[PDB]
Amino acid sequence: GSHMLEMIIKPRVRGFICVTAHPTGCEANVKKQIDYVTTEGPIANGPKRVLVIGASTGYGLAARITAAFGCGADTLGVFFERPGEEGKPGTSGWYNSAAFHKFAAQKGLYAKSINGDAFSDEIKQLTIDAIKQDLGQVDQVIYSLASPRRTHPKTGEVFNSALKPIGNAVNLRGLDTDKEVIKESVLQPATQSEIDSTVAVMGGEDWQMWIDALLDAGVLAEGAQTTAFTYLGEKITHDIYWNGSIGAAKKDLDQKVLAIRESLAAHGGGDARVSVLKAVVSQASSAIPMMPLYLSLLFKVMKEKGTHEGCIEQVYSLYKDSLCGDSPHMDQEGRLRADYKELDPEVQNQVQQLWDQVTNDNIYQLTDFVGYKSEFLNLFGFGIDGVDYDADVNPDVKIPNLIQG
Numbered sequence: 086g087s088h089m090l091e092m093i094i095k096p097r098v099r100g101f102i103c104v105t106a107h108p109t110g111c112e113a114n115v116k117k118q119i120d121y122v123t124t125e126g127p128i129a130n131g132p133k134r135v136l137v138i139g140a141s142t143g144y145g146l147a148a149r150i151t152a153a154f155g156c157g158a159d160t161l162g163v164f165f166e167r168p169g170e171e172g173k174p175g176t177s178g179w180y181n182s183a184a185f186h187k188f189a190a191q192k193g194l195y196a197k198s199i200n201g202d203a204f205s206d207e208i209k210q211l212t213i214d215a216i217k218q219d220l221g222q223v224d225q226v227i228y229s230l231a232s233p234r235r236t237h238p239k240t241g242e243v244f245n246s247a248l249k250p251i252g253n254a255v256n257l258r259g260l261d262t263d264k265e266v267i268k269e270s271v272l273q274p275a276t277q278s279e280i281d282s283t284v285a286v287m288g289g290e291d292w293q294m295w296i297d298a299l300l301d302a303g304v305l306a307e308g309a310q311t312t313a314f315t316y317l318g319e320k321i322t323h324d325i326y327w328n329g330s331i332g333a334a335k336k337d338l339d340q341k342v343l344a345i346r347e348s349l350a351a352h353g354g355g356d357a358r359v360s361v362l363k364a365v366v367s368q369a370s371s372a373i374p375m376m377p378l379y380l381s382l383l384f385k386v387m388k389e390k391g392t393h394e395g396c397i398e399q400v401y402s403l404y405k406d407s408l409c410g411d412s413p414h415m416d417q418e419g420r421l422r423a424d425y426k427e428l429d430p431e432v433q434n435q436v437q438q439l440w441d442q443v444t445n446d447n448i449y450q451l452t453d454f455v456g457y458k459s460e461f462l463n464l465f466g467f468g469i470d471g472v473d474y475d476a477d478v479n480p481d482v483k484i485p486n487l488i489q490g
């Protein structure tokens with residue numbers, strides 16, 4: 086009666102939230118990303134020992150897969166996910182990470198993971214301990230956390246991030262993905278306390294605390310390199326993103342990367358860069374006002390140009406061109422740029438024109454909302470080819486070498 090312990094798992098979506106995840110589908114999604122990387126080919130001169138903070142979904146998962154299956158790296162991942170249990174599917178990041186460990190072992194690559202709050206001292210200590218035991222040191226640290234809150238590791242204060250404009254309220258158009266309607270709403274500007282809290286969570290302090298802690302522990306190698314992911318976006322997103330409260334946080338990253346680069350470049354010519362990536366569908370981005378509509382438009386325009394990319398394609402090129410290659414593709418600030426295809430003037434102009442014309446009636450003629458919906462479901466392991474969604478599956482999937490914080 087093994088079906089008592091198993092279930093048929095279907096999507097249960099509410100706005101930008103899906104409360105279920107499919108273990109087999111997440112495994113298939115991970116395999117697809119791995120197969121992309123191995124199909125593209127290896128990346129020369131990559132790091133061989135990598136710490137990825139935020140390693141279970143989205144860009145961080147893509148970085149772990151790229152490092153491991155592209156650069157041949159041993160990888161230590163840190164993330165914050167819910168394991169499955171009977172009757173209750175775990176989070177997609179849990180199942181993604183289970184799959185990553187399975188495939189890494191098949192290839193003879195080291196994979197160990199730590200599940201817990203990355204903002205906490207405990208998790209940093211557990212991470213230091215794992216590196217010491219296993220790897221000696223790491224050559225690269227990827228900082229790829231997206232979180233709505235942070236408990237300060239010293240004072241215990243809980244900071245909450247806000248996704249609001251700064252200065253003036255803004256009329257933002259968007260797509261209500263449940264009702265499938267184009268709708269506007271007015272978002273009020275952030276208070277100073279809200280801006281400060283957002284910087285506390287998504288700014289660069291914790292990144293700094295990580296690098297310093299690893300440094301003080303002697304677990305970073307000569308020539309070590311670290312990067313945190315950021316988003317600048319097209320001008321149309323500037324009100325809510327770059328010049329909003331979240332932008333105040335990402336701008337803080339810029340006030341961190343200098344000190345970090347300074348510490349590493351003395352340590353064997355190591356380096357640090359904020360890396361700027363394109364918008365993609367993710368658990369994080371889907372929750373940002375305007376983003377489902379913007380993404381649906383951007384996908385259409387970029388597909389027409391042959392330049393559309395998801396997480397894995399974006400990060401593979403970041404490693405190949407910029408982190409390990411001869412094309413930092415530097416901007417005037419010293420950031421690594423991998424987002425130029427989204428920011429091309431002809432792309433921005435086309436997105437802007439469509440933005441002004443889209444209505445309930447022409448959604449499927451003017452946008453790639455179909456593609457948006459598909460990629461969103463894929464995040465949670467749904468709609469993946471070759472997966473039998475009618476078969477019972479055990480939601481309790483275990484991960485070897487998983488340290489629970």
Ligand SMILES: NC(=O)C1=CN([C@@H]2O[C@H](COP(=O)(O)OP(=O)(O)OC[C@H]3O[C@@H](n4cnc5c(N)ncnc54)[C@H](O)[C@@H]3O)[C@@H](O)[C@H]2O)C=CC1
Binds near residue numbers: 164203228229363370
């Ligand atoms: N998704 C997008 O359009 C873009 C995202 N970025 C940036 O890339 C980074 C990652 O974003 P996504 O891939 O979208 O996010 P995501 O939602 O797919 O993944 C976030 C990761 O952070 C982990 N995490 C969250 N809170 C944690 C905690 N307290 N302790 C340990 N782990 C925690 C999650 O487990 C997960 O691995 C972010 O800095 C984001 O700003 C930059 C360009 C655009």
Ligand code: NA
Binds near residue numbers: 139143146229
């Ligand atoms: Na991530």
